[PDB]
């Protein structure tokens, strides 16, 4: 499923997401604009065997059980087909435990990228959930 803007604004604000771990809303919207486009079946396989997935590009090597080495890392336990379903709850709760890993949203390289420095607040106007 693609999400509208302030659709999934609002989606993440009823996950917890707006200011969760010092992270505005806005923060949240435009990494999952630029990792994505807001794209829940969204999938980058990488030149490693990895692959990062949904709308908010979560990679496989460390977050979720692609089934080939069960038992081993899957911090967020889930299915990395988890990440893929029109339900964010299992992006947004896999991506709450990633954001507190200790490298802030600097672990989601297209927000570094496109929306560090930037005013995020343009991701949620107009919303006015």
Same mark, same amino acid.
Not at 6 to 13: R, T, Y
Not at 45 to 53: A, I
């Given at each position: &499923?693609?999400?509208?803007?302030?659709?999934?604004?609002?989606?993440? &604000?009823?996950?917890?997401?707006?200011?969760? /771990?010092?992270?505005?809303?806005?923060?949240?919207?435009?990494?999952? &604009?630029?990792?994505?486009?807001?794209?829940?079946?969204?999938?980058?396989?990488?030149?490693?065997?990895?692959?990062?997935?949904?709308?908010?590009?979560?990679?496989?090597?460390?977050?979720?059980?692609?089934?080939?080495? %069960?038992?081993?890392?899957?911090?967020?336990?889930? %299915?990395?087909?988890?990440?893929?379903?029109?339900?964010?709850?299992?992006?947004?709760?896999?991506? &709450?435990?990633?954001?507190?890993?200790?490298?802030?949203?600097?672990?989601?390289?297209?927000? /570094?990228? /496109?929306?560090?420095?930037?005013?995020?607040?343009?991701?949620?106007?107009?919303? /006015?959930?």
């Amino acid at each position: &499923k693609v999400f509208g803007r302030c659709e999934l604004a609002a989606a993440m &604000k009823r996950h917890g997401l707006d200011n969760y /771990r010092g992270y505005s809303l806005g923060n949240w919207v435009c990494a999952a &604009k630029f990792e994505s486009n807001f794209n829940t079946q969204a999938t980058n396989r990488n030149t490693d065997g990895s692959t990062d997935y949904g709308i908010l590009q979560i990679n496989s090597r460390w977050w979720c059980n692609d089934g080939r080495t %069960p038992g081993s890392r899957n911090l967020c336990n889930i %299915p990395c087909s988890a990440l893929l379903s029109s339900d964010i709850t299992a992006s947004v709760n896999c991506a &709450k435990k990633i954001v507190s890993d200790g490298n802030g949203m600097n672990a989601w390289v297209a927000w /570094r990228n /496109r929306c560090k420095g930037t005013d995020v607040q343009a991701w949620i106007r107009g919303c /006015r959930l």
